[PDB]
Write an enzyme that holds these catalytic residues in place. Structure first.
Site: not given
Ligand SMILES: NC(=O)C1=CN([C@@H]2O[C@H](COP(=O)(O)OP(=O)(O)OC[C@H]3O[C@@H](n4cnc5c(N)ncnc54)[C@H](OP(=O)(O)O)[C@@H]3O)[C@@H](O)[C@H]2O)C=CC1
Ligand SMILES: COc1ccccc1/C(=C/c1coc2nc(N)nc(N)c12)C1CC1
Length: 186
Positions: A22, A30
């Site tokens: 995060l 949240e």
């Molecule tokens: N709501 C929030 O604030 C959220 C925050 N996050 C944050 O985001 C970060 C991680 O995200 P991010 O770095 O974008 O990475 P992703 O989770 O999207 O991972 C990227 C990897 O997944 C695979 N991938 C992604 N898209 C595809 C696709 N269409 N087809 C096949 N493989 C795919 C690839 O793997 P490969 O190389 O193996 O093929 C790629 O290298 C962290 O900081 C986490 O904390 C994540 C979710 C929600």
């Molecule tokens: C480090 O983040 C986690 C740790 C443990 C379990 C779940 C999460 C996740 C969280 C959120 C993804 O979209 C999200 N969207 C909202 N509005 N809030 C969130 N908190 C997530 C994403 C899947 C990795």
């Protein structure tokens, strides 16, 4: 299968992650909202499916994998099988949605929730058809190294209310945020 949705929390400078965590301190309620939205299924005898990229899967602490009460699918072209704790593996978003129509899942899956990261959101957001974004606006800047894609408001309509989504400003750990729901259909 039911609706397709993305859910994210994003800072003012569009940040969603920094160094696989995060950008902001943990926001307990949240996170509760994320759990509630992604876990709650409208249809009896079904679960929702969460789809996430590989980096997002491994950002969940090993003890919190898989996200409980949801079917967990990871997207990767490198991995040869689902990671420890995951249920499904697909090589692309298109493939994952196709899978949801197979015998194994067609009757088991209600909503599908894209839960990150940036490239999976971008592909989903640009996928034709009916799609909602559940976006939590964290109303401060936070240093980030991964960002949410541009929301094209010509297509995505911000909804004026949504059941189960609080409309007023929230605050935890001195950080104000608010919940929004966007809908497109193209
Ligand atoms: N709501 C929030 O604030 C959220 C925050 N996050 C944050 O985001 C970060 C991680 O995200 P991010 O770095 O974008 O990475 P992703 O989770 O999207 O991972 C990227 C990897 O997944 C695979 N991938 C992604 N898209 C595809 C696709 N269409 N087809 C096949 N493989 C795919 C690839 O793997 P490969 O190389 O193996 O093929 C790629 O290298 C962290 O900081 C986490 O904390 C994540 C979710 C929600
Ligand atoms: C480090 O983040 C986690 C740790 C443990 C379990 C779940 C999460 C996740 C969280 C959120 C993804 O979209 C999200 N969207 C909202 N509005 N809030 C969130 N908190 C997530 C994403 C899947 C990795």
């Amino acid at each position: 299968v039911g609706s397709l949705n993305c859910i994210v929390a994003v800072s003012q400078n569009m940040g969603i992650g920094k160094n696989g965590d995060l950008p902001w301190p943990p926001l307990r309620n949240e996170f509760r909202y994320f759990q509630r939205m992604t876990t709650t299924s409208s249809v009896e005898g079904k679960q929702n499916l969460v789809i996430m990229g590989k980096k997002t899967w491994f950002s969940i602490p090993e003890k919190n994998r898989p996200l409980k009460g949801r079917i967990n699918l990871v997207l990767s072209r490198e991995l040869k099988e689902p990671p420890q704790g995951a249920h499904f593996l697909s090589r692309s978003l298109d493939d994952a949605l196709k899978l949801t129509e197979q015998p194994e899942l067609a009757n088991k899956v209600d909503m599908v929730w894209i839960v990150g990261g940036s490239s999976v959101y971008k592909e989903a957001m640009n996928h034709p058809g009916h799609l909602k974004l559940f976006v939590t606006r964290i109303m401060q800047d936070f240093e980030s190294d991964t960002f949410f894609p541009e929301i094209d408001l010509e297509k995505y309509k911000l909804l004026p209310e949504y059941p189960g989504v609080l409309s007023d400003v929230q605050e935890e750990k001195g950080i104000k945020y608010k919940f929004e729901v966007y809908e497109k259909n193209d």
